[PDB]
Design a protein around this nucleic acid. Structure first.
Ligand code: MG
Ligand code: MG
Ligand code: MG
Ligand code: ZN
Ligand code: ZN
Lengths: 820, 823
RNA sequence: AUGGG
RNA sequence: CCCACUC
C-alpha cells in the first residue's frame, strides 16, 4: 500500500510538494508572486488532505543551500494560511523539521475533542455564500455547518421598488435609483475590458448569497456613488447570448438537497434597454433569485482528501456527507487498568501465554529484548504472532513474532523478529504494519494525541526522527494509547482479543446481575426464562451472593439444585452456598433451608417424586425465594417435570441480554431458534415458544457479542477429522492459546473412545480429561449430555450426519468448529 | 420599571446613544476620526448590551436633516463591526427603522438555536490571547469558549528555538551589536524600542504578549532587538532610567485579570534582568528581558470587550462575570399536544378562550362581545385569550382599576395586548399596559423558550366606547403561531391562574395516560399483583386504563372484568366511564359472580372482613384458567377501624411501588411530604411498621419535581364559624370573578355531624353577597360533604374545615391545585 | 475606500 | 508587509 521512499521510509502517507523557498526574509522578497501563491497553496492543500486523511508528512526541497530553520524562520504568508486553516490553534496539528536539504511538515489527523463543535472535516473555504446586510460573506466551516443543520430541520422598503425596477422595461439615461443596496438589492457595473468572463467570475458569490438568504436582485449596469444606470454599448455583446450564458452558468452551480423533490434553482433573468435622448445606449441586466429550499454552492468546497496517493478536491455532495457524518468505551478504563497497568516496576511482557511459548521455543529472545529495550526504567511490551494479522491485514510466515514497546518520554517501537535474515521483505512489512496499526488506533480506538510508531527489524543472532511532540510525555498519554489499543483488540480476533473479551464479559455480567437483583425485593417466587446463550450459571451465582447480602442469612441456607453432576461440582467450587443434584435433593432431608435457586429445571425428572411440591413446601413453612431458571430450547431428558402448567408459571421474566458468545455463534443460535419455532417439536409446547423474539435477540447480539470464528465441515472421515482437530490445535497453541481453552464434544457418548484413539494418533503425527476437568489444564473430551452447564472458548463438535447445533453452540464462546 | 419615554413608549429597554452621523457616503467623507470611532464604538456597545440583556431599541439622532435611510444607506464601518460581532448572520438580530430625525435599531435577544455552539452571550473581543507560530491572536468568542472548557476540563526543528534563547539570561555581559542566532518562534518575541516614548508603548505592548506566553507555552520577550538584523541596540543612558525594572512591571503585569479553575490561586511569575550594552567596552544602554512562564488557567490582557445592561446603563463585563455567563421537564415534551388540543390553529373563526372566564365576562358585561368583535375586525384567524389581569398571570402585579386583559394572536399580525378600563378618568393605564407587554415578551423568552421575533403592542379600551415595528416582527405562517402558542403554554404552566389550572389538568391527563401505558406491561409478567401507591397518585385513573388494557390484551367482554371498591360514590364514579361491572365490596360479597374472569380491587386498605373473606372469594373466582387479581393499596389512608382479610405483608408478593404519579401542586405535595415524615417519625397502630418502609422521601422529591405544578396552599387558624363562612364566600366569589366554575370547588368537613350546621352558616354568608352531596361530583354544583364520603375523588379547589393530628393527608389528596385549611 | 497579524 | 469586505 505504501510507496517505496527509500530516502525516508516513514510509516505514513508522504506528500512531496517539490521545491519551496523558505525563510521570512527570503519569502518577503520575490518577483513573480504567482509562484509564491502557488507554493503557499500547494502546501496548504497538502495539509488539508493530510488532516482529512489521517495525518502524514509533507516533503519540500529547500532552494537556499545555506538555509537554516533556526535562523530564517518559515515565512509570513504560510503562517497566515495556517491561521486561516486552523482557527483554534495550528500548533496541535502542525510541526516543522529540517533534514539537511529537506523541509518536513508533520501533520496530525483532524479529530475534534470532547470540548469543541462537531466539525468533522477541515476546509479552507465553505464556498457557500450568505448575505449579512449588503456584502456577500463566504461562510466558514462552523457557519456552513450551522446552516446545514438549519436546513436539515426543514429595511424591507429596499426589496420593494427593486421589483418595481424589475417590472419596468424602457429606461432613459441616468436614472438616480432612489434605493441603495440591501439584503435583497446589490449592483455592479460593467467592465469594458471583459464582460462575459467577469460576469462568470462575479455572479456565483451573489447568486448563492441570495439563494441562501431570502431572495434578491442582481443588477448589472448601475454605479455606486452616482446611483445611475450606465450599461455597455449594444455592439459589445448580444443580449440573447448573455441570457443563455447566464442560464447555463446558473444551471452549473453546485447544489445540495435535504428534500426529496429535487427542484432546480428558480431564477428570472431579464434584459432592459437604457436609452439616451430617445436613442439606444446600453443594457442593464436584472437577475431575481428567490429563496431556495436548500444549500446552493458557488464552486466546489475548498476541502481536500487523499485518493490513490493524490491530493484531490472534495465535491459538494461528498463534502456535505462527511460534514454531517458502545459498552467498550464505558469499560475501556477498567480493562486498561486491569490488563495494562502503568507502573514503574521495570517492563512487563504481555500476554503471558504467548510470551512463555516464544521464550521456551527461543531462549535468546528474552535477553535480546531485555537488552534492546534498555535503557528504559518502565514500559510495556506486547507480543503477537502477527500484529498485521491481529489488525487484520496480512500474515507472514517469515516473521517469528512482533513486539510493541510503549513507554513514557519515548515513542512507540514496532520490533519485527525475522526467522531468516536475508528475506528481502522485512522492512516493507514492518513499515506497513506500523502504518496500519497507527491508522487503526486512530480510526477505531479514538486516540486524538500525537504518537509515532518506529519500525525496526531484528534477527535472532543479532534512523527516522520525529518531532519531540510525537512522544508519550506522561502516564496519561500512555493510558489513552492503551485504551485505544484495548478498543482495537476488542474489535478484532486474536489471542489477546479472546482474553480481553473474556474480561469484558466478566464486567458485563456484574451489571446484568445488579439489574436482575432488584427483583429480589419485588418477588418471592419467580420463573426466569433464558434465551440460548445467556450464562444462567454466573447469573445464579451472583444472585446467591446478593441473596446472602440482602437477606442476612448463612450461606448454608441457600440451596442450588441442578440436574448434572459436573455443573454441581463447578458450582460448589464457585460459591460457598450448598449445591446438590436433583437426585440428592430428593430422598434428602432439608429442614434448615430458606432460599432455593433451581437451574436446569428443563430436564428435571418427576419419576422419583414431585420436586416442585417439595421446593414449595420448603419455601412455604416465612416466605422464601423460589427462583427457577428455564431455557425451553435445551430439553434432553425424555420425561416431564413436576412443573405446573405454563399458564400457572407466574410471575416471570425473559432475560434477553446476556449473550456472551461470538457474533457468528449468535447467528447460528438465531437460525436454529427460527427453525425450531417454525416447526415446533413434541416436547416443546407452543405457549413456551412465544416469549422469545428474534428482534430482541438480534438487539442483544449487536450489543454484547464480539468477533469470532464458526466453521462447519461436512462429509468427512474419522482420521481426517482427527487430523483437522490436531492441526487447528497446533495453530492455536502456536498463536498462544492454552490447552484449557479447547474442548471436543461428541454427540453420542459411545463414540468417545474411538474418537479418542484417532485423536492420539493425529497429535502423534503432528492428554484428554473427563467432564470434571474443565478447570484443569487439559483438553476436555466428553459428550453434550455430560457437558451441560459448562463452557470453553474453543469447541469442536463431532456428530455423524438435526436440531442439535444449538446445544453445541451454547458451549462455545469464540470458536466453534462443527465437523461431521 | 420602564422609563417614561413619552415620545416613543415602546415596551422595550431603549438605549439613547446620542447625536450620530449616518450614511454610506457621509461617514466616508468625515475628518476627526476620534468621533467616527467613538460613535461606532458607542453603537456597538449598545448592541452588545441589548443582545446580552433581552433585546430592545437603540435610538439615535441623525446628523443630516436631508438623510433618508432608503437613499443614503447605513454605512460601511458600522456594517463591518456588525459583521465582526455576529459572524453567522446579523439580519436575524438587527433591524433598522427611521422615524423623522430618529434612527431606531431593533435588537433581538441572542438565544442560540439547537444547531450552533452553546455560545450563551455575544462578545466583541474576548481579550485573552494565544501564541500560534510567531503572533498573538485575540481569541474569538467560540475559540475562547473552547479554551475555557479545555482548561476547566482538568538538523533543526521548532523546539530548538527555546535552546540558544533560554541561555540569553545567563549572558550577564553583552557587547554592542552582537548577532542573535535565533529567529522569532513560539517561545521568543523581540520588539524594537521607540525613540519618542519608551514607557507608555512598553506598557501598551506587554499585556497582549504576556497573555499569549502564559496561555500557550510560556517563553520570554526581549526589548532591544531588531527584526531585520537581530541587533542588541536597546535604549540609551539618558532616555531610560533604572526605574523600569522587575518591580515596575510587577504592577503592570499584575494589572492583568486572571480567572482560575484551580484552588491554589498562583499569581503569574516573571523575572526581569538588565543586559548592559557595551559600545567599545563602554556602557551605552540596556536591553530588557521578561520571562513569562505558562499559566495554569486563563490570563486576560484586559477586561473582556463585552457589555450588558445594568441600571439602564451599558455596563462592561469583568473577566470573572464574562467567563461565568459564557460557561453557565416534561412540559416541553407534551407542549405540542397541549397546544394542538387547547389552542387549535385554524381559520374557521376567532376563538375566545378560556370559555368559563369569557362566559363570566360576557354575562357581567353584555356589550363586551361586540366591542371585542369590532376591535380585531377586519380579521379571519387567531385566538383571543382573556384574563382578569395578564400582569398578574405572569406574576408581577394585580390592579383593581383594570377590568380584563385580552391577548390577540393572529397570522400576518403582531401580538396585541388589550387593557380594558372601567373608568377612562384613570390616568395610569398606559404605563401599566406597556409594562405588562414588556413582561409578557420576556416571559415568552426566558421561560417559554421562544426564539423568533415577536412584538406585543398595548392598546387601551374603555367600556363606554401608534407604535411602529418592523414587518419581520409580525407572525408569518401557522407554524410561527404554533410555536408562539407553545411558548405561551410553557409560560402559563409555570404560573398560577385559571388557564394554568386547566392546562395543568390536561397535562396530568397525558401524564396519567403514559404512566398507565408503562404499567400495562406487568399484565404480561404476572397474574396477581400488589400495587403500593403513594398519596396523591390518582390510582383510579390507573385502574380504569388497566381494565381498558385487559379488555384488549385478553380479548374478552367488559362483563368478565370486575371493579371492587368500598364507597358507593366511587362506585358510581367508576361505572360512569368504564363498561365493566363496578360494584362495591359489600355487594361483591353476599353475591355470585360466575362469569367473572378478572378482578381489580381499589381502596383495599379499608376493606372489612366482618362479612367473610373477600380475598379468598376473589382468589377462588380467579383460580377455577388463571385470572388477574391486581390489588391497589394506599397504606397511608386508612379510615375504617376494621381488620382486613388481606394476607400478612410478608406474603403480599409479587408487588410494585408506583412512586411517581404525583398529580397535585408543589405546595400540596410539600404538605403531603411533611405529613409522610410526621407519620413515619411516630408510626400509628392501624398501619403495620413493615408497610411503612416501602416509601422514601427522595423518590417523592424526584416525582414532585418532575410532575407537580405551582399552586396555592393556605392554612388559617383560630377562627369562628362565621369567619370561616365569610372566608369561604369571599374566596368563592373572587374565584368566580377570576373565571372559575362551581364544579371545581369542594368544601369538606372532617366530622359529618358538622355538615348541616356548616350548610346554614355558609348559606347566610353567601347570601350576604345550591349545594350537592359527595355523590354529586359529576354535577355542576359545589359539594359540601365529608372527606369520608369524598374519599377516592378529587377537586381542583378544596376548603378543608376542621375543628381545632395526622389527617391533613386526606384533604391534600382530594385537592389538585388549591387547598385552604381553615381551623 | 474597512478591520486582525 | 499579510489578510478580509470593497466599488
Ligand atoms: Mg456590496
Ligand atoms: Mg455591488
Ligand atoms: Mg511577531
Ligand atoms: Zn431542497
Ligand atoms: Zn489555575
Amino acid at each position: 500500500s505504501l510507496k517505496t521512499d527509500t530516502e525516508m521510509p516513514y510509516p505514513e502517507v508522504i506528500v512531496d510538494v517539490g521545491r519551496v523557498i523558505f525563510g521570512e526574509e527570503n519569502r518577503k522578497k520575490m518577483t513573480n508572486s504567482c509562484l509564491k501563491r502557488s507554493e503557499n497553496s500547494r502546501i496548504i492543500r497538502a495539509i488539508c488532505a493530510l488532516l482529512n486523511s489521517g495525518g502524514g508528512v509533507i516533503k519540500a526541497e529547500i532552494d537556499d543551500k545555506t538555509y537554516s530553520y533556526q535562523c530564517h524562520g518559515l515565512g509570513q504568508d504560510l503562517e497566515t494560511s495556517f491561521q486561516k486553516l486552523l482557527p483554534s490553534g495550528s500548533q496541535k496539528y502542525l510541526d516543522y523539521m529540517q533534514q539537511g536539504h529537506n523541509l518536513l511538515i508533520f501533520v496530525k489527523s483532524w479529530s475534534p475533542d470532547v470540548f469543541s463543535l462537531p466539525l468533522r472535516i477541515c476546509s479552507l473555504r465553505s464556498n457557500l455564500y450568505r448575505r449579512d446586510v449588503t456584502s456577500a460573506i463566504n461562510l466558514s466551516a462552523s457557519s456552513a455547518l450551522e446552516l446545514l443543520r438549519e436546513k436539515g430541520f426543514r429595511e424591507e422598503d429596499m426589496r420593494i421598488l427593486a421589483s418595481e425596477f424589475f417590472k419596468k422595461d424602457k429606461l432613459m439615461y441616468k436614472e438616480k435609483l432612489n434605493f441603495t443596496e440591501s439584503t435583497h438589492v446589490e449592483f455592479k457595473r460593467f467592465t469594458t475590458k471583459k464582460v462575459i468572463p467577469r460576469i462568470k467570475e462575479m455572479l456565483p458569490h451573489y447568486v448563492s448569497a441570495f439563494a441562501n438568504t431570502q431572495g434578491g436582485y442582481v443588477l448589472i449596469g448601475v454605479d455606486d456613488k452616482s446611483k445611475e444606470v450606465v450599461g455597455c454599448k449594444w455592439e459589445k455583446v448580444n443580449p440573447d447570448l448573455l441570457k443563455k450564458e447566464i442560464e447555463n452558468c446558473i444551471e452549473k452551480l453546485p447544489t445540495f438537497h435535504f428534500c426529496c423533490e429535487k427542484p432546480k434553482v428558480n431564477f428570472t433573468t431579464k434584459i432592459l434597454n437604457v436609452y439616451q435622448k430617445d436613442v439606444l445606449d446600453g443594457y442593464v441586466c436584472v437577475i431575481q433569485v428567490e429563496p431556495f429550499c436548500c444549500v446552493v454552492f458557488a464552486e466546489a468546497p475548498d476541502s481536500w482528501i487523499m485518493k490513490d496517493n493524490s491530493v484531490t478536491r472534495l465535491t459538494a455532495e461528498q463534502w456535505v456527507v462527511m460534514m454531517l457524518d458502545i459498552k467498550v468505551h464505558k469499560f475501556k478504563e477498567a480493562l486498561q487498568r486491569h490488563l495494562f497497568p502503568v507502573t514503574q516496576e521495570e517492563v512487563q511482557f504481555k500476554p503471558e501465554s504467548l510470551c512463555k511459548k516464544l521464550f521456551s521455543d527461543h531462549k535468546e529472545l528474552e535477553g535480546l529484548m531485555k537488552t534492546l529495550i534498555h535503557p528504559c526504567s518502565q514500559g510495556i511490551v506486547i507480543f503477537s504472532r502477527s500484529w498485521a494479522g491481529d489488525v487484520g491485514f496480512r500474515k507472514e510466515q517469515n516473521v517469528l513474532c512482533d513486539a510493541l514497546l510503549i513507554a513514557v518520554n519515548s515513542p512507540v517501537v514496532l520490533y519485527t523478529i525475522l526467522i531468516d535474515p536475508n528475506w528481502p521483505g522485512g522492512l516493507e512489512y514492518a513499515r506497513n504494519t506500523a502504518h496500519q496499526l497507527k491508522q487503526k488506533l486512530q480510526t477505531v480506538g479514538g486516540y486524538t494525541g500525537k504518537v509515532c510508531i518506529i519500525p525496526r527489524l531484528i534477527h535472532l543472532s543479532s534512523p527516522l526522527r520525529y518531532p519531540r511532540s510525537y512522544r508519550l510525555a506522561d502516564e496519561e498519554e500512555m493510558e489513552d494509547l492503551l485504551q485505544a489499543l484495548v478498543v482495537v483488540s476488542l474489535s478484532s480476533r486474536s489471542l489477546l482479543s479472546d482474553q480481553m473479551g473474556c474480561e469484558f464479559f466478566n464486567l458485563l455480567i456484574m451489571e446484568q446481575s445488579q439489574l436482575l437483583s432488584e427483583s429480589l425485593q419485588k418477588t418471592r417466587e419467580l420463573f426466569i426464562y433464558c434465551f440460548p446463550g445467556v450464562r444462567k450459571t454466573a447469573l445464579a451465582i451472583k444472585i446467591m451472593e446478593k441473596i446472602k447480602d440482602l437477606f442476612h442469612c448463612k450461606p448454608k441456607e441457600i440451596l442450588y439444585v441442578c440436574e448434572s453432576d459436573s455443573l454441581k461440582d463447578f458450582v460448589t467450587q464457585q460459591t460457598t452456598c450448598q449445591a446438590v443434584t436433583r437426585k440428592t435433593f430428593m430422598q434428602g432431608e432439608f429442614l434448615k433451608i430458606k432460599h432455593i435457586v433451581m437451574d436446569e429445571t428443563e430436564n428435571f425428572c418427576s419419576k422419583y417424586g414431585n420436586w416442585y411440591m417439595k421446593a414449595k413446601n420448603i419455601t412455604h413453612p416465612h416466605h422464601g425465594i423460589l427462583w427457577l431458571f428455564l431455557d425451553p430450547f435445551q430439553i434432553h431428558h425424555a420425561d416431564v417435570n413436576g412443573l405446573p402448567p405454563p399458564s400457572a408459571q407466574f410471575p416471570r421474566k425473559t432475560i434477553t441480554s446476556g449473550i456472551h458468545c461470538a457474533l457468528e455463534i449468535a447467528k447460528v443460535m438465531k437460525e436454529e431458534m427460527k427453525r425450531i419455532k417454525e416447526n415446533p417439536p413434541s416436547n416443546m409446547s407452543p405457549d413456551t415458544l412465544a416469549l422469545f423474539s428474534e428482534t430482541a435477540y438480534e438487539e442483544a447480539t449487536c450489543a454484547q457479542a464480539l468477533p469470532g470464528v464458526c466453521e462447519t465441515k461436512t462429509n468427512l472421515t474419522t482420521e481426517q477429522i482427527a487430523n483437522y482437530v490436531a492441526r487447528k490445535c497446533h495453530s492455536l497453541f502456536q498463536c498462544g492459546y492454552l490447552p484449557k481453552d479447547i474442548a471436543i464434544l461428541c454427540r453420542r457418548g459411545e463414540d468417545r473412545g474411538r474418537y479418542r484413539l484417532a485423536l492420539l494418533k493425529a497429535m502423534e503425527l503432528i492428554v484428554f480429561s473427563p467432564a470434571t476437568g474443565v478447570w484443569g489444564s487439559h483438553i476436555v473430551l466428553d459428550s453434550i449430555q455430560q457437558f451441560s452447564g459448562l463452557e470453553r472458548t474453543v469447541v469442536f463438535g463431532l456428530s455423524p450426519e438435526e436440531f442439535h447445533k444449538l446445544c453445541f453452540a451454547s458451549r462455545a464462546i469464540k470458536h466453534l468448529y462443527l465437523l461431521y
